[PDB]
Design an enzyme around this catalytic site. Structure first.
Site, PDB file in Angstrom:
ATOM      1  CB  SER A   1      11.044   8.498  33.989  1.00  0.00           C
ATOM      2  OG  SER A   1      11.798   7.315  34.525  1.00  0.00           O
TER       3      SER A   1
ATOM      4  CB  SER B   1      13.520   3.775  38.202  1.00  0.00           C
ATOM      5  OG  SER B   1      13.689   4.861  37.216  1.00  0.00           O
TER       6      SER B   1
ATOM      7  CE  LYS C   1      19.195   2.791  33.804  1.00  0.00           C
ATOM      8  NZ  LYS C   1      17.797   3.350  34.107  1.00  0.00           N
TER       9      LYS C   1
ATOM     10  CG  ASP D   1      17.125   2.909  37.604  1.00  0.00           C
ATOM     11  OD1 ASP D   1      17.746   4.035  36.886  1.00  0.00           O
ATOM     12  OD2 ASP D   1      16.227   2.103  36.991  1.00  0.00           O
TER      13      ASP D   1
ATOM     14  NE  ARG E   1      12.397  -1.787  35.965  1.00  0.00           N
ATOM     15  CZ  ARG E   1      11.206  -1.770  36.357  1.00  0.00           C
ATOM     16  NH1 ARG E   1      10.276  -0.978  36.413  1.00  0.00           N
ATOM     17  NH2 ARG E   1      10.919  -2.997  37.637  1.00  0.00           N
TER      18      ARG E   1
ATOM     19  CG  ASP F   1       9.873   6.322  37.514  1.00  0.00           C
ATOM     20  OD1 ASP F   1       8.738   6.632  36.829  1.00  0.00           O
ATOM     21  OD2 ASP F   1      11.098   6.356  36.696  1.00  0.00           O
TER      22      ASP F   1
ATOM     23  CB  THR G   1      16.488   6.173  33.645  1.00  0.00           C
ATOM     24  OG1 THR G   1      16.728   5.597  32.507  1.00  0.00           O
ATOM     25  CG2 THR G   1      18.071   6.595  34.022  1.00  0.00           C
TER      26      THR G   1
ATOM     27  N   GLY H   1      17.572   8.929  29.021  1.00  0.00           N
ATOM     28  CA  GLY H   1      17.064   9.182  27.973  1.00  0.00           C
ATOM     29  C   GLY H   1      17.279   8.161  26.937  1.00  0.00           C
TER      30      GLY H   1
END
Ligand SMILES: [Cl-]
Ligand SMILES: [Mg+2]
Ligand SMILES: [Mg+2]
Ligand SMILES: [Mg+2]
EC number: 3.4.25.1
Lengths: 250, 196, 195, 226, 204, 231, 241, 243, 244
Positions: free
Chosen positions: D129, D169, D33, D17, D19, D166, D1, D47
């Site tokens: 992340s 994400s 999100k 994002d 995902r 990342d 994330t 999280g």
């Protein structure tokens, strides 16, 4: 200390009457007139803002209250009892419904929850009944538009149109002659204003009258854009100016 | 963290760096560790950010309610409310707080509250991971009844060294001056204090 | 305890349960009856942790007997099994869970059908033609899969059960001291005293 | 994330994002999100996904009731205070990492919350992340007095850094702009830089390919009349 | 030891043109031991279908729980619950056990009776909603199902074409999982007819 | 009248009738006397029987090695209050290694009786107590009333016809206070005091009850032939 | 006739215990007045110290609830302090939970809800007080919100409470009928206090010394009470024009 | 009627008759007074000698709270003790949390709220005492008097009990004749006189005088009882004035 | 204290009657008449709404007939609000039983549970009883079609035909006269309406003043259907039976 009144203060008399409920209805009778009319494409609820003093700012006292985005309420009787019921009704709409199903309750079920609270004050220990009668107007997807009356006993009935309080008997007769199943919302507002004028003594204008509708979705009142399915609240309180405009075509 | 509070002639000054850490990653390089629990009673926070924020919010609530009933509280009173929370919840907290305030009767006062929850009234106090590296410097350079300008220099030089050696400390040096005149905020950037 | 088997045939349910009770080093008893009659046409066998097994079985028995008196009516095997499952499903998230596996064999007098329910300590219920708990299935299911027919007689069911017990006695390391066999049918519950 | 928040001239913007993952597997390729606490208070969560929505809706519900009780539009500091005290009580066990942003009668605001209830204030923030990839972009291109157009550009660029660099994400960029004296505009799938290419082959089967044992009509209707 | 893979099993759901499909295997086991080939994992409350994978006792418990709740819903609301509403009820009910959860992987499928719009949704054990346009997967062969669905699926499939796609997705995924198989069921759901088909598959 | 239905109700003249009715139960009770010197403190109690077949109701209760009381009124209420004193004396010894002061013991009895006079549902205690003891400040005598009022005295008497013994002690005040280091003479003065309250009946061997505590004398009760010496 | 002893309905739909609590309100024989300026809200109240043995500094019916909110009470002092302590606790808790200072009108509503509960629940009596809350709200500006034993509350342009409230009310009504605005068009609070005292003098028909009055003033971010010498300066300015 | 049978019931006047009946119990009690001096306070009380059998100086009526507050009361003695016990708990929790000893005004409200709470319900009886209390804090000396209703104010001089009118008149003279103030030692002497003069309302039985004081100079701000030579000096001064 | 104001709702009279129960029954006697009739092939529930208005929304209204589950329904006579409290409790009990035993609750077990709740309010708690009388119409596979009634005392009894509310004496006489054991649902529908038509205090019996419901095995094959009649359907059955 401790609440040592664990017994009922409302009991059956020899004749089968529940005295405290009857007396609560008497308090409602003394209260200021309020009414509700259902149309094909909406519902209107109205009442008089009986100001206790001209120094008082009557805009700060709301007799017509939003319960959910699509449900509104008005009363006749004891104002303070109404205020706390609105607080409880708003909270119960979330705790016992929205936090479970992720949506606002339909009109009939919220009315059912308010009724339950009023019934319990009629049987529980160390309390008196609520001294109010409510009129709750609302809309939901599967039931459409609806109007409900809730009494101190906890009993509730659906209406096409009705009135409660001071001049309810005369007002209900006036509504019977005017109501039909083909009324548009504007026609129902017009009839509401005509009906309410009969029970008002003094000034009759946008500042002394409180009136709200349950009608079309108001995307302008939503506060955000970007979600097509969220189209805004159907509850809308009419402004002082909007009332006066319809008093010229009266 | 590197935090300190120093009493001087006209009152007391609180000082702090601005770095907040989650491991080696600097989660916030511009943090405000100098926190207000009353008009002229502030504190310096070290340890768990969550714990010290929760404690400071509760203390502010207690002192606001104290003020409504009994008028302005003493710095000693504020320190006692801090202590009561830190001591009675020692098993579940990681907080090292310095309490600093200005009365007109008592003037500038400093109370340090380490991990255990004990209270220690001192002329000046240092705390946080970076304080270890400046015990020597501060002990040699502290004098009582310094001027405002001398105290600002003492704190600036002290925290400069703490920041230089402690990886956990860094960023800007924030300060808050507490005197009869009022409450003054100061800030000092890296280009200023690094060349000292 | 150790081995408990069950098989549903044409017109009855047959439950077989071991007789041994072992306290670690020694075999304290070799004639133990690991079953309780819940109602005239419903039998429950059990196996699990010591103490918990009997305590649970008798607790269920009392509750079903209470229901029978209150309503003057025998609950269906399906209804009893659901009650038992709920009690175990309640138990698994308790402070100290019942470590008990059960088989419920009953004859439904309304539908005129035998019924066998297998329920483990977690509250996992399945209706089966034949069932078992623990390692008992590992040895016996390959034989039952081969020979079982839904239209078997009670005598054929007992013969297939003997073949299962013989395989257990041959390949299991533990001596379970034989089995007590009980039959559940329209006439009620009876014990086969020679097996 | 990857989630970010950026202050600008007359308001604040947040982005994220799309995902969501179960270990190394992508559970949903177009996840939402950006959550709404109130009409003009939005937050992004990282999280434990169930915790971030649960805690958002609980506080959002109480914020709505509070707004009705006080006859005032909700404030961001109210949402912040209610979130942190809830999260602190549960000592981090409710794994919600939030960036809270909005506008109210006081002005525009931007905060972040950590699972243990620790909060901080800033002009630009990132969480999740991909926060390090995003923060690298924010530290390189952020300035004071950004315009609305510049802030949206910076925010989405920071999310892209998370998307590409990342593994936690990916997929699309969601944005929400909250400007003072205006309705909040929620821009779902503001960027779509990860459309899958056409496959080499159609995998539509001939009818009757699957072996069937039994067919039956399922009665979904209620018990009928007559 | 791991509660979510003691009993085994899988569920998959897909959308098509004016229809949805939901399917599951029939296995129940005790780790390596196969116990039952008739353990159906798809249930329905009115026109809303719910598949549940994971620990079997919780599967049974939740079915009984949602039957309970949807029945009380119907009496009070005087109408059958819709997929969108039911999805929120599942999410609420799971999250109330946040720190002592049901070890399950639920999947909702159905058509809204008023709008006619096809709907599917998935959840983790703790309540998080995954509401995808295309497909939802769950169970011990979820990885395998993701691989099948991602290649085999295309949008706007007719009911009888969608049946072949979801059936092949389940079967070939189940055959690459030790704890899934032993039979399979597929529901094809249209606005006012539902067909249920049992599939022939290898029994190892 | 209208204000005596419960203990939570003041009368128009500011009286608590339930408390006054509880005080009345003491006046019906049998007489008991208390008196002290500087070295010793004595209790003398006239025990009452139901009839000739019955025993004589015990009037004196020991609370500790250095403290005890005599009762007049509802005996079960004396058992409750004396049990409370035993515990408080005991708490003081276990926690503080300290013998409970007689004055502090009176303060605890006052506060326990008070709570029963201000709350709804409960009732006042229906008993009066005479507490004697020897602590770090010498000999003591206390008088407890169920209104809560506790008083420290040289001597006193409570119960039926207690006014006669109280007047005698008021005359003898200067004499008996000086009886130091002579337990027998101090008891003699107590027996002569309680005799001023007798009518028709006289002090017999199973009628009389005496208790004493002093400098090197633990609280001990004398009954039966042990009091024939003083008849 | 036990319907007059506890808070249950009489046959007329009346709550007599609530009505009698209103009568207790005037037991102190003190009149209060509240008005709004441009930037401030002023509240004045009569001060009466009948005993010479009393310390006059401790005799007060004006309370500082929070930094921003002030409260004047009409009724007996025990009930007044009961309400004060509670309002202070509520205002503090509000700030802790919701992260901003409790508004005047919201506090009024909260205290009014608490009063409503006493009119419905039997074991609790109503408080025999009328609470007038004043502040300069950050959203609504100058604010006057008043609560009574019935649980009723409302905002006010200006208001008056006490035995002679009607005389003060009509005096204020007539002034606002002339000016045709909802406030006192005055820059400084000093002159708004002078307006308040002047119009009380006119309505009651009595003259005041520095020890006969008690004044409270609300400005942006603080509420404060005036000392005897601050009031004296106010009385001097009134007399000089 | 019936409005006076239950506590917390408003009469049609707006009065709580039960509280007014509690005042009658206060008026029935012995005389007690309080005098505020330059740097402290003095308390005094009348103790009726019902009998020769009462041990002199032993039945102490005045009570200390914390180490800096004195409390005296007239009316039902047990009720007064119950109130002081609460006061001691209130002062203990204040010092526990805030470190500093409780200020006198703060302490006054703690008692006030507690007494007021006993007028809110019919399940409790109002206090049958008026309590005169005070001491020295950081802001100087304070004297308070608290009634059964919960009502309290600050005082220059205070008196309650059967001889309150007589006492009040004597206190009013002191206020007029000493605008600059009264010293601690003077106040002890004056307190003795006022109790002796107020004893004319209780002239049947003879009495025992009991005095206490808190003073910044004379007692370091701590509450102490007046004993020995200083007590006898005050008795002599008092006896000289009545003759 | 508080004792002064206690009505003591749970005491015996000198004659051994429960005051509040008796007075609650007096209240119920003024409520709209509800009738239940049991036949071999089904059950009928008919009930009269109390003096309505032309402005009452009838099609969305429910004051008399309530659904407890798919097999059991109730007719109410008394305080509607009190009845809804009990109805929701009964709906939950049915679902608890279904969750526990995986079988629909037998009618008598549900009736006993509600009746026991009513009993409790007469023996302990010091609260007023529920001013409600129920007629239970239900079906299970043990006893088949069943009619019961319960009243504020918590006592319940079984019936072939029964009335509650107003004019029960007159209504019970008319039912006792025309009822036969081999009767069918269509005949019972006619009896229920004819009885209400004669006992009503209104001038005439019309569709807008009635609520009507049938429990029939007239559902396709071995199963039971509940039919809550719509306003137009009540109007049709009134013409069919020749009342309007
Ligand atoms: Cl509230
Ligand atoms: Mg560094
Ligand atoms: Mg295999
Ligand atoms: Mg009340």
């Amino acid at each position: 200390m401790t609440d040592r009144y664990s017994f009922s203060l409302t009991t059956f008399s020899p004749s089968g009457k529940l005295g405290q409920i009857d007396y609560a209805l008497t308090a409602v009778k003394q209260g200021v007139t309020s009414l509700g009319i259902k149309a094909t494409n909406g519902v209107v609820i109205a009442t008089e803002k009986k100001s206790s003093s001209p120094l008082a700012m009557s805009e700060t006292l709301s007799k017509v209250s939003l319960l959910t985005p699509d449900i509104g309420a008005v009363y006749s009787g004891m104002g303070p009892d109404y205020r706390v019921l609105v607080d409880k009704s708003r909270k119960v709409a979330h705790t016992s419904y929205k936090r479970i199903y992720g949506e606002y309750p339909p009109t009939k079920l919220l009315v059912s929850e308010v009724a339950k609270i009023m019934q319990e004050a009629t049987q529980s220990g160390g309390v008196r009944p609520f001294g109010v009668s409510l009129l709750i107007a609302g809309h939901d997807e599967f039931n459409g538009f609806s109007l409900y009356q809730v009494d101190p006993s906890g009993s509730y009935f659906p209406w096409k149109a009705t009135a409660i309080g001071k001049g309810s008997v005369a007002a209900k007769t006036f509504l019977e002659k005017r109501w039909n199943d083909e009324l548009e919302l504007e026609d129902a507002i017009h009839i509401a204003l005509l009906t309410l004028k009969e029970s008002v003594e003094g000034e009759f204008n946008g500042d002394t009258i409180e009136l709200a509708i349950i009608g079309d979705e108001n995307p302008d009142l939503l506060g955000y854009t970007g979600i097509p399915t969220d189209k805004g609240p159907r509850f809308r309180k009419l402004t002082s100016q909007e009332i006066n405009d319809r008093l010229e075509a009266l | 963290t590197s935090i300190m509070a120093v009493t001087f002639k006209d009152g007391v000054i609180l000082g702090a760096d601005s770095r907040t850490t989650t491991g080696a990653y600097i989660a916030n390089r511009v943090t405000d560790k100098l926190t207000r629990v009353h008009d002229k009673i502030w504190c310096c926070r070290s340890g768990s950010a969550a714990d010290t924020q929760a404690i400071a919010d509760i203390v502010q609530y207690h002192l606001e309610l104290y003020t409504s009933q009994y008028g302005t509280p003493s710095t000693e009173t504020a320190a006692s409310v801090f202590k009561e929370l830190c001591y009675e919840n020692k098993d579940n907290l990681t907080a090292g707080i310095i309490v600093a305030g200005y009365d007109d009767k008592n003037k500038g006062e400093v109370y340090t509250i380490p991990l255990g929850g004990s209270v220690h009234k001192l002329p000046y106090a240092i705390a946080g991971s970076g304080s270890t590296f400046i015990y020597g410097y501060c002990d040699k350079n502290f004098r009582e009844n310094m001027s405002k300008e001398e105290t600002v220099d003492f704190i600036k030089h002290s925290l400069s060294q703490a920041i230089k050696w402690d990886g956990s400390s860094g960023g800007v040096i924030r300060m808050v001056v507490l005197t009869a005149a009022g409450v003054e905020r100061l800030i000092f950037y890296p280009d200023e204090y690094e060349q000292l | 305890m150790d081995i408990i088997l069950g098989i549903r045939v044409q017109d009855s349910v047959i439950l077989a349960s071991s007789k041994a009770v072992t306290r670690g080093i020694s075999v304290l008893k070799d004639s133990d009856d690991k079953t309780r009659q819940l109602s005239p046409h419903t039998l429950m066998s059990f196996a699990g942790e010591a103490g918990d097994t009997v305590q649970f079985a008798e607790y269920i028995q009392a509750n079903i007997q209470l229901y029978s008196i209150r309503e003057d009516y025998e609950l269906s095997p399906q209804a009893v099994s659901s009650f038992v499952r709920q009690e175990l499903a309640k138990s698994i998230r308790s402070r100290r869970p019942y470590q008990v596996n059960v088989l419920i064999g009953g004859y439904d007098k309304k539908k005129n059908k035998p019924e066998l329910y297998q329920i483990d300590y977690l509250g996992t219920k399945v209706e089966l033609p034949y069932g078992a708990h623990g390692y008992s299935g590992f040895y016996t299911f390959s034989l039952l899969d081969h020979h079982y027919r839904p239209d078997m007689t009670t005598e054929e069911g007992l013969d297939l059960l003997k073949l299962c017990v013989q395989e257990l006695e041959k390949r299991m390391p533990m001596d379970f001291k034989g089995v007590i066999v009980k039959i559940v049918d329209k006439d009620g519950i009876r014990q086969v005293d020679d097996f | 994330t990857t989630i970010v928040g950026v202050k600008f001239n007359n308001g604040v913007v947040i982005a994220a994002d799309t995902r969501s993952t179960q270990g190394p597997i992508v559970a949903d390729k177009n996840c939402a999100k950006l959550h709404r606490i109130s009409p003009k208070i939005w937050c992004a969560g990282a999280g434990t996904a169930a915790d971030t929505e649960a805690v958002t809706q609980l506080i959002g519900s109480n914020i709505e009731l509070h707004s009705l009780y006080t006859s005032r539009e909700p404030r961001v500091v109210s949402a912040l205070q209610m979130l942190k005290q809830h999260l602190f009580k549960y000592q981090g066990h409710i794994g919600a990492y939030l960036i809270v942003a909005g506008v109210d009668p006081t002005g525009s605001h931007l905060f972040s919350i950590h699972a243990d209830g620790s909060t901080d204030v800033g002009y630009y923030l990132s969480l999740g992340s991909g926060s390090l990839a995003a923060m690298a972009v924010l530290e390189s291109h952020w300035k004071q007095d950004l315009t609305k157009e510049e802030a949206i550009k910076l925010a989405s660029d920071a999310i892209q850094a998370g998307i590409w660099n990342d593994l936690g994400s990916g997929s699309n960029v969601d944005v929400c702009v909250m400007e003072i004296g205006k309705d909040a505009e929620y821009l779902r799938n503001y960027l779509t830089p990860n459309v899958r290419e056409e496959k080499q082959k159609s995998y539509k089967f001939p009818r009757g390919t699957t072996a069937v044992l039994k067919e039956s009509i399922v009665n979904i209707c209620d018990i009928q009349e007559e | 030891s791991d509660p979510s893979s003691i009993n085994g099993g899988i569920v998959v759901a897909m959308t098509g043109k004016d229809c949805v499909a939901i399917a599951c295997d029939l296995r129940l086991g005790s780790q390596s031991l196969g116990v039952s080939n008739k353990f159906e994992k798809i249930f329905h409350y009115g026109h809303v279908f719910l598949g549940i994978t994971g620990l079997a006792t919780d599967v049974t418990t939740l079915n009984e729980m949602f039957r309970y709740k949807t029945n009380l819903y119907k009496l009070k609301e005087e109408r059958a619950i819709e997929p969108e509403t039911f999805t929120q009820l599942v999410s609420s009910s799971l999250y109330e056990r946040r720190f002592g959860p049901y070890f399950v992987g639920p999947v909702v499928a159905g058509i809204n009776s008023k709008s006619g719009k096809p709907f599917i949704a998935g959840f983790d054990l703790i309540g998080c909603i995954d509401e995808a346009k295309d497909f939802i997967v769950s169970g011990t062969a979820s990885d395998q199902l993701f691989g099948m669905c991602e290649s085999l699926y295309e949008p706007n499939l007719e009911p009888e074409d969608l049946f072949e796609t979801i059936s092949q997705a389940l079967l070939n995924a189940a055959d690459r999982d030790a704890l899934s198989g032993w039979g399979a069921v597929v529901y094809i759901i249209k606005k006012d007819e539902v067909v249920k088909r049992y599939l022939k598959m290898r029994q190892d | 009248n209208n204000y005596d239905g419960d203990t939570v109700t003041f009368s128009p003249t500011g009286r608590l009738f339930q408390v006054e009715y509880a005080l009345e139960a003491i006046k019906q009770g049998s007489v008991t006397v208390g008196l002290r010197s500087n070295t010793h403190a004595v209790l003398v109690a006239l025990k009452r029987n139901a009839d000739e077949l019955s025993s004589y109701q015990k009037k004196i209760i020991k609370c500790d090695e250095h403290m005890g009381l005599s009762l007049a009124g509802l005996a079960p209420d004396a058992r409750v209050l004396s049990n409370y004193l035993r515990q408080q004396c005991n708490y003081s010894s276990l926690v503080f290694n300290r013998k409970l002061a007689v004055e502090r013991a009176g303060h605890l009895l006052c506060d326990k009786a008070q709570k029963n006079t201000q709350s709804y549902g409960g009732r006042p205690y229906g008993v009066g107590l005479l507490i004697i003891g020897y602590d770090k400040s010498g000999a003591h005598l206390l008088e407890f009333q169920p209104s809560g009022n506790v008083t420290e005295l040289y001597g006193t008497a409570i119960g039926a016809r207690s006014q006669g013994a109280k007047t005698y002690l008021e005359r003898t005040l200067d004499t008996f206070i000086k009886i130091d280091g002579n337990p027998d003479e101090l008891i003699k003065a107590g027996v002569e005091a309680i005799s001023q309250s007798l009518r028709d009946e006289s002090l017999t061997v199973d009628n009389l009850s005496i208790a004493i505590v002093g400098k090197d004398t633990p609280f001990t009760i004398y009954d039966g032939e042990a009091v024939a010496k003083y008849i | 006739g036990y319907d007059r002893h506890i808070t249950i309905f009489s046959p007329e739909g009346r709550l007599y215990q609530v009505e009698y609590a209103f009568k207790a309100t005037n037991q102190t024989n003190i009149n209060s007045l509240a008005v709004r300026g441009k930037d401030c809200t002023v509240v004045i109240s009569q001060k009466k110290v009948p005993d010479k043995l009393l310390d006059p500094t401790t005799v007060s019916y004006i309370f500082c609830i929070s930094r921003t909110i002030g409260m004047v009470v009409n009724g007996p002092i025990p009930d007044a302090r009961n309400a004060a302590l509670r309002a202070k606790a509520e205002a503090a808790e509000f700030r802790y939970k919701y992260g901003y200072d409790m508004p005047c009108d919201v506090l009024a509503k909260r205290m009014a809800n608490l009063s409503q509960i006493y009119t419905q629940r039997a074991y609790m009596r109503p408080l025999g007080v009328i609470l007038t809350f004043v502040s300069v709200d950050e959203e609504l500006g100058p604010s006057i919100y008043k609560t009574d034993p019935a649980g009723y509350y409302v905002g006010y342009k200006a208001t008056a409470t006490g035995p002679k409230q009607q005389e003060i009310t009509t005096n204020l009504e007539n002034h606002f009928k002339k000016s045709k605005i909802d406030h006192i068009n005055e820059e400084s609070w000093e002159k708004v206090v002078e307006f308040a005292i002047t119009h009380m003098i006119d309505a009651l028909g009595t003259e005041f010394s520095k020890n006969d009055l008690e004044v409270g003033v609300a400005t942006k971010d603080k509420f404060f009470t005036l000392s005897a010498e601050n009031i004296e300066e106010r009385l001097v300015a009134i007399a000089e024009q | 009627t019936g409005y006076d049978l239950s506590n917390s019931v408003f009469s049609p006047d707006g009065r709580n008759f039960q509280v007014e009946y509690a005042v009658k119990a206060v008026e029935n009690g012995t005389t007690s007074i309080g005098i505020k001096c330059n740097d402290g306070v003095v308390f005094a009380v009348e103790k009726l000698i019902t009998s020769k059998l009462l041990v002199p100086q032993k039945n102490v009526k005045i009570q200390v709270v914390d180490r800096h507050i004195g409390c005296v009361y007239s009316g039902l003695i047990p009720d007064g003790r119950h109130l002081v016990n609460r006061g001691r708990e209130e002062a203990a929790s204040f010092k526990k949390l805030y470190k500093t000893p409780i200020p006198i005004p703060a302490f006054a409200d703690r008692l006030g709220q507690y007494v007021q709470a006993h007028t809110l319900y019919n399940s409790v009886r109002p206090f049958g005492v008026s309590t005169i209390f005070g001491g020295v804090d950081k802001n100087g000396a304070h004297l308070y008097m608290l009634e059964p209703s919960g009502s309290y104010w600050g005082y220059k001089g205070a008196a309650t009990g059967k001889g309150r009118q007589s006492a009040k008149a004597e206190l009013e003279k002191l206020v007029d004749h000493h605008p600059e103030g009264l010293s601690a030692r003077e106040a002890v002497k004056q307190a003795a006189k006022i109790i002796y003069l107020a004893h004319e309302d209780n002239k049947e039985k003879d009495f025992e005088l009991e005095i206490s004081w808190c003073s910044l100079s004379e007692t370091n701000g701590l509450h102490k009882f007046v004993k020995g030579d200083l007590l006898q000096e005050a008795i002599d001064f008092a006896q000289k004035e009545i003759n | 204290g508080s004792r002064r104001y206690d009505s003591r709702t749970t005491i015996f009279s000198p004659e051994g009657r429960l005051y509040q129960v008796e007075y609650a029954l007096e209240s119920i006697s003024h409520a709209g008449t509800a009738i239940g009739i049991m036949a071999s092939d089904g059950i009928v529930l008919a009930a009269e709404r109390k003096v309505t208005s032309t402005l009452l929304e009838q099609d969305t209204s429910t004051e008399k007939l309530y659904k407890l589950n798919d097999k059991i329904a109730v007719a109410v006579a008394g305080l509607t609000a009190d009845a809804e409290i009990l109805i929701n409790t009964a709906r939950i009990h049915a679902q608890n039983y279904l969750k526990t035993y995986n079988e629909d609750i037998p009618v008598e077990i549900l009736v006993r549970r509600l009746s026991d709740i009513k009993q409790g309010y007469t023996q302990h708690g010091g609260l007023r009883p529920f001013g409600v009388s129920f007629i239970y119409a239900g079906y299970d596979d043990r006893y088949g079609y069943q009619l019961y009634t319960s009243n504020p005392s918590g006592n319940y009894t079984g019936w072939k035909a029964i009335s509650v509310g107003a004019n029960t004496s007159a209504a019970q006489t008319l039912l006792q006269m025309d009822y036969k054991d081999d009767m069918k649902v269509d005949d019972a529908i006619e009896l229920a309406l004819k009885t209400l038509s004669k006992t009503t205090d209104s001038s005439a019996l019309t569709y807008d003043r009635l609520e009507f419901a049938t429990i029939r095995k007239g559902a396709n094959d071995g199963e039971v259907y509940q039919k809550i009649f719509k306003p137009q359907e009540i109007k049709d059955i009134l013409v069919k039976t020749g009342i309007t």
